Ligand binder design. Structure first.
Ligand SMILES: CC(=O)N[C@@H]1[C@@H](O)[C@H](O)[C@@H](CO)O[C@@H]1O
Ligand SMILES: CC(=O)N[C@@H]1[C@@H](O)[C@H](O)[C@@H](CO)O[C@@H]1O
Ligand SMILES: CC(=O)N[C@@H]1[C@@H](O)[C@H](O)[C@@H](CO)O[C@@H]1O
Ligand SMILES: CC(=O)N[C@@H]1[C@@H](O)[C@H](O)[C@@H](CO)O[C@@H]1O
Ligand SMILES: CC(=O)N[C@@H]1[C@@H](O)[C@H](O)[C@@H](CO)O[C@@H]1O
Ligand SMILES: CC(=O)N[C@@H]1[C@@H](O)[C@H](O)[C@@H](CO)O[C@H]1O
Ligand SMILES: CC(=O)N[C@@H]1[C@@H](O)[C@H](O)[C@@H](CO)O[C@H]1O
Ligand SMILES: CC(=O)N[C@@H]1[C@@H](O)[C@H](O)[C@@H](CO)O[C@H]1O
Ligand SMILES: CC(=O)N[C@@H]1[C@@H](O)[C@H](O)[C@@H](CO)O[C@H]1O
Lengths: 324, 160, 324, 160, 324, 160
């Protein structure tokens, strides 16, 4: 009669590495690295992402004519830009503190767009219909940004304008505007009469003055002139005042922002899809319990810690010695 | 093996044993077969389970982490930001692989230690009533029947 | 006769966790995590901290009328701001590179305040007594910053002023000043006569020109105008020159700084107290030898490494099996 | 136990022993009691002391570390700065807990190993002059008096 | 007959530390920490480094008169500045976004310097020979930057100039220029006639206007006036246009850059030497296979990971117990 | 020693042995000397080699890493950049020393375990044909000649 003491073994092929030996077959192990995604852009918190498509944040906020599709969107789980998001500022110029605005939008889950300065009633003494350009076309015809209003002189007169807005939206209000710069003093006069105009913008915390900078610059989209874009976040209860004797591209629509942490902007060519997830990456959604993933470092929602690893298997059983 | 048991003085494993990681074979008159040692196997399962959970606990969840843009005159901070992302990325990849690499060694040694102890336990139970053949087998002197084998397993046996 | 080999055991209840097992009672252990403080703001190096109280760095350096208490303080172990440090720039305006100045002050352990441009002798040709405003009151009456001098025209004349200062303090000298911006050209003339004034400041390394920006802005503390604040650190031996034809809020007092690493600014509501410590945190002082602490990440002096841990106990003895 | 001694073949501890971590009981004619093995206990104390000090050495002291302010148009660097603070904070918290967690295991095994070795040492000293009862006890054959017990302890004993 | 089982031992004195015990003599070990360098600045990729010597990036790019030595250099493995690199802007002024330019140069392995605006043919209507100053001397005589051209009026006339350049170098082109600021309106007229001049620079993406800022500033190198320096990277195919009615320090030479990652600028007093290496540090070159080094954190090429360690020896053999 | 062998029940090393880390002495009639146990020594060399390589693998190569300049109004980012450089510098120095410190302990225990196992292996080979003297020596009963010793080494011996 005999009694032996031994240990388990099986047909497992699982392998793990150790300090002293590589490729050791084990009886049981757990993979800690997630490496699969559905290659689709899904919704988080049951809300679809905002697909800017051919437009970029600039084109969206300013209202580039090629972004009308986005006009009715006002809430999203995250913003998506693509490798072909080129429609931004159709009229050549500098967008001041643009990256900063993008950073700001990263914590905005939605807004209430409103006509801060109604077009048909806010400018009794200035023309509001000739503000179009071939640089910002729509349906082949000259047009302009949907959220700004290019004001020009009325009957050879551009009186000092003064327009203010008091914020009672109970939240931050994003106000955008522009300053135009004709290529010649002749154009400066055709558009605004006043040779030496200025634009002035101010609130309790914002204060800035702008001067036309007349000069011909290399043409871009047919324009030798330039148009600079500005923005500011007006606080609840504060007031913003615009004063100008020419060159002001006035705000038309503005946005009352709703903050809602846990969001951002991502660049992806992955297709949006009727689907849900708790974790989203530029390549597609992850659906896993594993502590790690090597899909992508950029992530949105509840996800596994990104890591450059190719393999991360932890041994649970023992060395497998079937000796068959 | 660090403890000389697994893949050591007990050369191989039993594909036959299928109720645990550690067990006995036994070849009595009444018959043969295999039997797993719950006491052992369970304490091991608990320990390993607690180990894997402890590892996962130490690693944090990745929440919303998106890039940032920089204009043409912010190359220095663009790089600083890049140096920070790669920086922590390399740190955590290091931590994850190194932790797993080191614990795999510890886990295997753990099993080796368990087999070893199960043996020594059984050994000091039988004492003179059997001899050490090798390969972790004990050849009895006083013909051990089925209920006799069982007594060795549950550590009751008891017989000077 | 018998001889047994055994191990210690006792009435210890200490517990520690391990990879394989949680909550293991041990015979001996050492706690490595410090989690106690005295909830008081004490002095380091035998020097009291500078409690700005209701004022903030701006109010302190400019000399806001509500910060007279700080006037006689010129050395500190660390600066303290509270959740109620609101008295800063009583006159609405932008404080340029303000955060930077704060960063600069973080390595200043003391200074020698001095009247760089004596009020009663540096401006023979400009008025030095009408520079007050209801925005910066004191004792109910209109007043102004203690460390600046608001210069206005004298008998309907504001001659080009030119004032220079050579630094022989043998150390950096912090010079602060302002540029005023009336809401209307009428006020521009009442205050400075010259419609088109300018302020010019320069040293061997600093060089900047300022232009009045006339415009009505939303009123803040009753002011539709604005006042911008500037500063610079004049190096030993260098010279700073001020030239202006109006709108200059001249320096009155300046500071010769003494650097002394190992200090900073903290925000706290903890009360200052007659007490000493080698380690200070916004919640209170630490007095420990332990390698760690989970009191606060912000620290001043010699302190334990901050960590998010709740427990950090290291086993020294062995598993405690009293089997009573 | 990794070495099968503590909480293993020597089931419990002696609240009675109070001069060290490892020791002997002994039940001679002249009387009973407990006695700690200095040699062992001290080498352990030295090692553990050196271990704790080594851990503390690896962790650095926290000096003046205060925040920074950023204006409304520096949200990107404010976040970069925040990402860096949380970054190292999580790294060090990880390092501190993981180090302690892992060394606690090693420390317990260390003690287990020490008890185990003390036994085997005593065992090979007595050889034939006594038998292994279990629970780490040796029952003598040649009545071992008080000064005889002591000889086993200080490793002098010596008697084929 | 006896058979014993033992272990190796030798005359080794190697020591290593462990958690439980310090200074343990071992039979075999490997040092992982490299701590030796040749104290020399060698070439990488078989290319010599650019030793600016007494000049700094500014002096090099602008062409300070004391940096003629660098004129013929157009490719390098890395740039070297010394503790005595003081020759930069000989004419007092501000160099805008200077650090940024330095950062840009860090990935430039070489360039093709060319005369973007030939001196003897680009300015028919302005003087091109009186643009020298005692602040930028050469051979005791007044001189100026080699890569810029200080234009002044011709026969009491300074017509509006307009000069453009189209980039066909098939790569980025670094264009540098300056804006002069006389100390008095008298000098403003002696130099440029026009009292109210302006300088205008533009491309598809760059757009900026400059105004003379007349004022006497503390003299630096004899100058009470100032000269600000600007630059921009003109993209392939783009056009840069300069327009001015005075005060423009025109570009003379520009640089077509060649990017070539894996390089940078370092500060060192180590001597350049006819030698090669795959790893370079400010103290000297490293030539090692070891995973670590404690020579210097700044490194160029293939190097061991820097670390603050003094010793890093890993035990391979066993505890050495010779018991002699 | 963690396994009680090296510097334990086998007090010292043999400067005489010079073909490996582990070996036998042997004192037969025909003569004495030393002989290294290839099987053992090699498996150890492989393991240690694999260990050192694995450590080096985890550490990355330092490529071009140069400083950045900041003007007088960029002290905040200059410091942020400095906090990041020192940050990772302290992390990696920590990782490098701590890794080496901990593996040195493991390596020494590894050797200790190997000596221990070589002994137990030899021991169960000889069984009754010799006695355990101590210091890891076996005194034979049946006079073991040169080719007899060799049989013990290559594990052939075999003789109940
Ligand atoms: C309104 C506007 O911006 N127009 C252009 C359009 O002409 C062009 O084809 C497109 C893609 O290049 O970008 C913009 O949409
Ligand atoms: C000199 C000055 O700044 N005065 C105001 C004071 O009137 C106000 O009550 C306080 C807090 O609201 O802020 C400032 O101290
Ligand atoms: C300030 C404080 O409360 N610290 C005291 C310290 O002064 C004193 O020397 C020590 C003596 O036990 O106790 C605490 O450490
Ligand atoms: C022209 C120029 O900027 N070079 C200067 C030179 O004028 C000066 O005399 C010397 C001493 O500091 O340093 C540089 O060589
Ligand atoms: C050659 C020249 O320009 N002379 C100056 C000299 O007067 C001055 O003392 C020195 C240090 O600043 O720099 C230059 O050498
Ligand atoms: C037609 C027009 O509007 N101009 C360009 C056109 O040259 C280009 O082909 C097109 C597609 O990239 O993008 C437009 O912006
Ligand atoms: C998003 C997805 O496809 N993953 C699914 C999840 O939706 C579902 O709620 C869960 C239930 O077990 O199983 C996951 O695999
Ligand atoms: C009298 C005075 O100057 N202090 C006012 C105080 O009355 C008011 O409640 C508070 C509201 O913010 O603003 C302070 O400036
Ligand atoms: C720069 C130097 O002298 N070091 C050389 C190195 O270039 C060479 O790769 C190595 C092995 O070939 O030998 C070193 O001595």
């Amino acid at each position: 009669d005999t009694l032996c003491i031994g240990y388990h073994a099986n047909n497992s092929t699982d392998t793990v590495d150790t300090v002293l030996e590589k490729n050791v077959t084990v009886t049981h192990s757990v993979n800690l690295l997630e490496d699969s995604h559905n290659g689709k852009l899904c919704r988080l918190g049951g809300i679809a992402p905002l697909q800017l498509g051919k437009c970029n944040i600039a084109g969206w906020l300013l209202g580039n004519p090629e972004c009308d599709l986005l006009l009715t969107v006002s809430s999203w789980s995250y913003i998506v830009e693509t490798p072909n998001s080129d429609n931004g500022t159709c009229y050549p110029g500098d967008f001041i503190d643009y990256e900063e605005l993008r950073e700001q939008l990263s914590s905005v889950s939605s807004f209430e767009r409103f006509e801060i300065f109604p077009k048909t009633s806010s400018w009794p003494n200035h023309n509001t219909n000739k503000g179009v350009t071939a640089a910002c076309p729509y349906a082949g015809a000259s047009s302009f940004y949907r959220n700004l209003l290019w004001l020009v002189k009325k009957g050879n007169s551009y009186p000092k304008l003064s327009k203010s807005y008091v914020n009672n939206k109970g939240k931050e209000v994003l106000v955008l505007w522009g300053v135009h710069h004709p290529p010649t003093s002749t154009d400066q006069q055709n558009l605004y009469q006043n040779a030496d105009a200025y634009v002035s913008v101010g609130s309790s915390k914002y204060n800035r003055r702008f001067t036309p900078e007349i000069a011909a610059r290399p043409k871009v989209r047919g324009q030798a002139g330039r148009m600079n874009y500005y923005w500011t976040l007006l606080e609840p209860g504060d007031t913003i005042t615009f004063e100008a004797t020419g060159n002001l591209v006035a705000p038309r629509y503005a946005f009352a922002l709703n903050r809602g942490s846990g969001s951002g902007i991502i660049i992806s060519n992955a297709p949006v899809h009727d689907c849900n997830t708790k974790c989203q990456t530029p390549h597609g959604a992850i659906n896993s319990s594993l502590p790690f993933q090597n899909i992508h470092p950029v992530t949105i929602g509840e996800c596994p810690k990104y890591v450059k690893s190719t393999k991360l298997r932890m041994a649970t059983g023992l060395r497998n010695i079937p000796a068959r | 093996g660090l403890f000389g048991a697994i893949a050591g003085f007990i050369e191989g494993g039993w594909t036959g044993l299928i109720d645990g990681w550690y067990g006995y074979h036994h070849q009595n008159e009444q018959g043969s077969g295999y039997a797993a040692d719950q006491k052992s196997t369970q304490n091991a399962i608990d320990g390993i389970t607690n180990k894997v959970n402890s590892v996962i606990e130490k690693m944090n969840t990745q929440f919303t982490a998106v890039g940032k843009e920089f204009n043409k005159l912010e190359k220095r901070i663009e790089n600083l930001n890049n140096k920070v992302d790669d920086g922590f990325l390399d740190i955590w990849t290091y931590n994850a692989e190194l932790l797993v690499l080191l614990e795999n060694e510890r886990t295997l040694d753990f099993h080796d230690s368990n087999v070893k102890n199960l043996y020594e336990k059984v050994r000091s139970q039988l004492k003179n009533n059997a001899k050490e053949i090798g390969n972790g087998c004990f050849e009895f002197y006083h013909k051990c029947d089925n209920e006799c084998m069982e007594s060795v397993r549950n550590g009751t046996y008891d017989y000077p």
